[PDB]
Amino acid sequence: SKIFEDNSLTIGHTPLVRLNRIGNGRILAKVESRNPSFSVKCRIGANMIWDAEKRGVLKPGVELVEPTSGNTGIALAYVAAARGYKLTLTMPETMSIERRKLLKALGANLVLTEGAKGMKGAIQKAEEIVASNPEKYLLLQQFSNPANPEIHEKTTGPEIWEDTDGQVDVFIAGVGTGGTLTGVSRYIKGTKGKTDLISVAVEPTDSPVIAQALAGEEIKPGPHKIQGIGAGFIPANLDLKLVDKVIGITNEEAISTARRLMEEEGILAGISSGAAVAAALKLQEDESFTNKNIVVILPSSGERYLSTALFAD
Amino acid sequence: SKIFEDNSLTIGHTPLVRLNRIGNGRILAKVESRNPSFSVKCRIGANMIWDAEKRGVLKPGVELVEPTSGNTGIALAYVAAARGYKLTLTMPETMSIERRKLLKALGANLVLTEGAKGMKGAIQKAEEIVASNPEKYLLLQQFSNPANPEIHEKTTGPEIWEDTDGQVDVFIAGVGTGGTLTGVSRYIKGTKGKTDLISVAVEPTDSPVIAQALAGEEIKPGPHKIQGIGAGFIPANLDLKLVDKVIGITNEEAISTARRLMEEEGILAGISSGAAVAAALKLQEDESFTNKNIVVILPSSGERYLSTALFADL
Amino acid sequence: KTVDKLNQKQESAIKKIDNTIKNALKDHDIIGTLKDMDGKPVPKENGGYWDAMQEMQNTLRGLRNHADTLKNVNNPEAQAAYGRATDAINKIESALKGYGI
RNA sequence: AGGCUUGUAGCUCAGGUGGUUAGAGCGCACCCCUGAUAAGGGUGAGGUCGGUGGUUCAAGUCCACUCAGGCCU
Ligand SMILES: [Mg+2]
Ligand SMILES: [Mg+2]
Incomplete structure (x- = not known):
């Protein structure tokens, strides 16, 4: 007996799908396009x-x-x-x-x-x-409002913890507002108590401001094609004490990984989704992450981006 | 502890949302756009x-x-x-x-x-x-394959019955292949044994094929705009014994009701979804349906119909 | 205070700043970069698509190289050229920051 | 013979006290841009700084001697 009162209350409970032909079979993809306006937003x-x-x-x-x-x-x-x-x-x-x-x-x-x-x-x-x-x-101020990470602390964190049965070891998510990464990282590392989680941020190589912020360098952005992430600064929702690793992804390998994900998995995916999965791949090329359960966030669908350069011919 | 093996196993469990600004508050939408390729199919x-x-x-x-x-x-x-x-x-x-x-x-x-x-x-x-x-x-033969109503008997019917707690009264479904209507009408009337259910079928007025088949007439279809329904013939998958009523919806009513549904309930809808909600509103004009729970299938979103006549407000 | 005189490196940097602002900091190039970031680019005259995003990355990298050529100089004209390059970099970044989210 | 003055990227050249190794203009290779040319930007290849020694914490730069070229002779 569950009749939702309005469509705003229908958020969450997105599937966590094992990627069988991209990687070694241990990349797990949380499809955030299964939302009532088909985004993580x-x-x-x-x-x-x-x-x-x-x-x-x-x-x-x-x-x-x-x-x-x-x-x-x-x-x-x-x-x-x-x-x-x-x-x-x-x-x-x-x-x-x-x-x-x-x-x-x-x-x-x-x-x-x-x-x-x-x-x-x-x-x-x-x-x-x-x-x-x-x-x-x-x-509303989406880059500073704490509702932006507390919805991920109270919904998608417990969903990852109850789908992986607590066996998540690497969490990988791109940072546009930083709310998803900080919410999931705060629930797993602080609320439930797994301080061994490796929180990996995905960023464009053409605007690598999280790496420049962690190193101490000057924050200096640029233009990129991976739309959804790469704000050009460090927003107040992003908490750099929770970030254990950052991976930069070029535009062409992001687009090619999105096309791989559509053609080999059946998951309609955008450029940011392919960027996050490609970060999971070039993290699995290291030997120490061979038998780690890797949970990756796929924010949007490629049908939203149908007239763009993700679809060549 | 549910890790899905592939994206084909993630079908179903689509939410049942109440309409507040369309009707009296007893129209219940089954938004089938929250499937892994965003359709009922x-x-x-x-x-x-x-x-x-x-x-x-x-x-x-x-x-x-x-x-x-x-x-x-x-x-x-x-x-x-x-x-x-x-x-x-x-x-x-x-x-x-x-x-x-x-x-x-x-x-x-x-x-x-x-x-x-x-x-x-x-x-x-x-x-x-x-x-x-x-x-x-x-x-695969979508118009004559019994897997098409088999999936709606094994998934969609139980979802509607377990979400309404056995309080469904009317079931509106648009008939393109006649699978969702046959499956849900076969689960509720057959398995759970509720013969009081009024299963109505939505078809265009330009192609009134189910009405001509139930009235014993000659099948003469026509071109229309409500895409998804109105195949032009009676498929081998729609059984006419489970259809109680047929409501004909014009093209403008479907466009206007889909636009109304998007801007008054936030549900991204297509032309067939507006046709089905328009049939529910045309059925609530009668006095006997003013306090009956109405469950209506919304099969697609307005993302796919973005270059069509549905979005003509610029 | 001992005000300096420019090398040929700093005068080259000033001329680069001025020509880059005059020929590449147009409104059309910022339109084209924002069109490249959200997918759909501007096409050729004969088939294909233009590339304003690589051009804007080149423009930013040039203006930063000529800005950090000119920090610790004491000639006022060098400081004015540094100010012009800093203003163009801030114009581009304020056009790009937060876009697409 | 003496007194002076030049030598730095393929060519013409600046280099402020001894401090990024080393730079500009034109010339070359690749990319964007101009339908195209001119105009304009990015990356790189390219440097026994005439040669040998000395001094200094540190020499293109300061000294000592040579190689080649210009002036009075
Ligand atoms: Mg221009
Ligand atoms: Mg010479």
Whole structure:
């Protein structure tokens, strides 16, 4: 007897699928595209609005504003539609007409900012929209809100621990906001008490800011094709005391691993998914990780990215 | 402790969500878009291959042929990629570039017929490929294979019955192949023994084939836009004994109800999902259905229908 | 305070900064880099696709090389060229930071 | 014979007190860019710093002698 009241409550319980033809048969893939807007972002777009309801700041009459150009907009769109709220998403003019049709047909009010300014133009437009009337709008701040890692501390951590039966030894996840890695690492290492877990972050080789942050070097980003990860800085959700290893992945091996994962596994996967699986592969080329159970996070599906360069001919 | 062996075993267990702003609060949606290739067909594309493995006809060294390009082709593609078999999909050449990229990315072989004949040419080309070398090829035959209602009797029916705690009253399902309606109507009326269930069938008004078959008329189909349902004939998999009502839904009602469902409940829906919810709303106009639990199947999302007439608000 | 006079290395760095800002820090190149990051690139005139992402990585690596050529110099014109290169790097990074998430 | 002054990448050349080994312009190879040319950027190959010694913690740079070229002679 389980009838969900709205579609925001249907998050989680994603399958953990053993990859048989990629690697040695010990890479385990947690398919996060089995979410109601088909991303890993559905967790945080539900929990940030739930936390805003619980701390009393989101009332009837308070609208939601967020600068985003990725899957967080789709997540906030379906949760604002399911729970009866309003949403204005600020984003640059560069992004496609298909993402705009999906976000407008799901209920959002798109504010298209100037494309040469780009992402901080979107952020500044969201900030003046909020500061015109601060008791009417609400800013979620996905790179600093602790709902973003506590949803992963309270949902996907126990799912990995109850699917692996506690036999997880290497956890591998890409870092866009850093909430997934810190939530899973905090649940396994602190709450349940397995301090031997190797938390590995996946990063682009064209913007390796986590490695530059761990080494002590200057943080200095660049452009890359692995979309979803590689923010260009160290967000407040990312906790570098939980990161035991970082692996950089180039764009072409990420795309080729996504195409391998589709063609040999049947899992529809994006570029970040292939990047994380390729990090698992070039970690398994070391001999000490031959008989380790490796759990890897596959955030999105490749059908979301169908008109892009993941599909050549 | 559940580690799945491949992605074909992850089918089912799709959530049952209440509609709050459509109807009176007694429409219950079965969102079948939360399957591993995001459709209702993931169940049947896994089960027909499992059944062909168990019957012994799908040996190692056997290729699969099916004349389709819709959700069933994507389902057969991901199951044949997960389990390790070869698939040859036959489709007319008027099909979009992006669906062909999605099918080539899953490792399928696309044999293209001409655009003059269309689906009959795709079926004839599939039959010629299987008749070339029958010990290597195998048709799955989605319209006449009992694995198609077998999977909905063994998975979907128990899910609806265990989530509603035995309180279903009306079951709306759109009939493209007649498998989900036959399976759930065969589990609830047959196994659990609830004959009070009203199983209605959604078809287009441009192709009212089930109504012409139940009224004893001549089958004359027509072109329509609600893709997924309205095959143009009565398949060998839909049994007409379990169909109580037939509700005809026009194209505009399906588009508008799918848009309404996306922007009022956050459920990413396609044209058939809007047709089924529109049939539930057309059935709640009568006074006897105002306090009956309605379970409605939502089989696809608006990701696939992104270049169609469903998204025309720019 | 002993103000210095430039080498040919620092004058080469200043001319590189100015030409790189004039020819590669256009609005069209930032549009093209953001189009490359979210998949779909801008096509050729005869078949194929352009590559603005490699060009922007080259532009960033050049501006950083000429910025860290010019830190501890005391000529004011060298400091103004360092400021121009720092502003172009901040313009690109503020166009790219947080995009795609 | 004396007094002076040159020699550094394929060519023309700067090198501030002895401190990244060593740099610029043109020339060469590869990539992006201009439909293309000019304009413009990135990576690299390329250096007994005329030769032999001395001094210094440290020599292209400071000394001592030679090799080759320019001025009064
Ligand atoms: Mg340009
Ligand atoms: Mg010379």
